[PDB]
Swiss-Prot record:
General remark: Highly up-regulated in Huntington disease patients, suggesting that participates in the altered chromatin modulation and transcription dysfunction observed in Huntington disease. Its down-regulation has salubrious effects on patients, suggesting that it may be a promising treatment in Huntington disease patients.
Tissue/organ expression: Widely expressed. High expression in testis.
Family: Belongs to the class V-like SAM-binding methyltransferase superfamily. Histone-lysine methyltransferase family. Suvar3-9 subfamily.
Section of the entire sequence shown: 196 to 399 of 1291
Oligomeric form and interacting partners: Part of a complex containing at least CDYL, REST, WIZ, SETDB1, EHMT1 and EHMT2. Forms a complex with ATRX, TRIM28 and ZNF274. Probably part of a corepressor complex containing ZNF304, TRIM28, SETDB1 and DNMT1. Interacts with TRIM28/TIF1B. Interacts with ATF7IP and ATF7IP2; the interaction with ATF7IP protects SETDB1 from proteasomal degradation and is required to stimulate histone methyltransferase activity and facilitate the conversion of dimethylated to trimethylated H3 'Lys-9'. Interacts with CBX1 and CBX5. Interacts with DNMT3A and DNMT3B. Interacts with SUMO2. Interacts with MPHOSPH8.
Tudor domain ranges (all copies): 68-127, 154-206
Name this polypeptide is given: Histone-lysine N-methyltransferase SETDB1
Organism: Homo sapiens
Length: 206
């Protein structure tokens, strides 16, 4: 059946849609289709294209209030400017300077503000089940379900550690700590990465 209304969605509303590049883009909802118990959403993008999308691949074109976001919430966030999907890992508190921690689907971790987030319209019941990479999906499942139990390593600037990258352990130095993230300098290539302090990639004991 073709619908005009579905929950709080209405044909002709402004929306974000996921493209095949995995980046998200502004568009208009032009149709809502039911296929059995399933639903699909047709989006005409502002520049290029039409797509027929599942409800976990569209997002509202506004910023969610803080009270609607939980650990595990499925969101689209500004990525450094692209829009990319992720999962809320922390909500604002004193220890993170009132920011949201986002774990992006590709494994990137960043603190963002509410103005950098868009809520996904119809997330999966287990929100991590549409993460493509099984290693990434399993980490997120474990993190979200164990929360607020979060084993982390206490690191300090200047500390020498080994950090995993592409299957091997590299000599590295802690440059800076920002809440639950640590900025690691790899000593061989002298390049930095922000890493979650509960990552098994971090080995201070060697
Ligand atoms: C940069 C970061 O720590 N992201 C968290 C994360 C989120 C999802 C999947 C993997 C990871 N991860 C990476 C990448 N390194 N360790 C872990 C855990």
């Amino acid at each position: 059946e073709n619908l005009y209304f579905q929950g709080d969605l209405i044909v002709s509303m402004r929306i974000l849609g996921k493209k095949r590049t995995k980046t998200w883009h502004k568009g208009t909802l032009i149709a809502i289709q039911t296929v059995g118990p399933g639903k699909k959403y047709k989006v005409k993008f502002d520049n290029k294209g039409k797509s027929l999308l599942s409800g976990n691949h569209i997002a509202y074109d506004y910023h969610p209030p803080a009270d609607k976001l939980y650990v595990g919430s499925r969101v689209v966030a500004k990525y450094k400017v692209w829009l990319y999907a992720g999962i809320v890992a922390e909500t604002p508190n004193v220890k993170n300077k009132l920011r949201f921690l986002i774990f992006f689907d590709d494994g990137y971790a960043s603190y963002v503000t509410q103005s950098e987030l868009y809520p996904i319209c119809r997330p999966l019941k287990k929100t991590w089940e549409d993460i493509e990479d099984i290693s990434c999906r399993d980490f997120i499942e474990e993190y979200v379900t164990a929360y607020p139990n979060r084993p982390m390593v206490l690191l300090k600037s200047g500390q020498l550690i080994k950090t995993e990258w592409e299957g091997t352990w590299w000599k590295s130095r802690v440059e800076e700590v920002d809440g639950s993230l640590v900025r690691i300098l790899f000593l061989d290539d002298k390049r930095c990465e922000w890493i979650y302090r509960g990552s098994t990639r971090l080995e201070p004991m060697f």
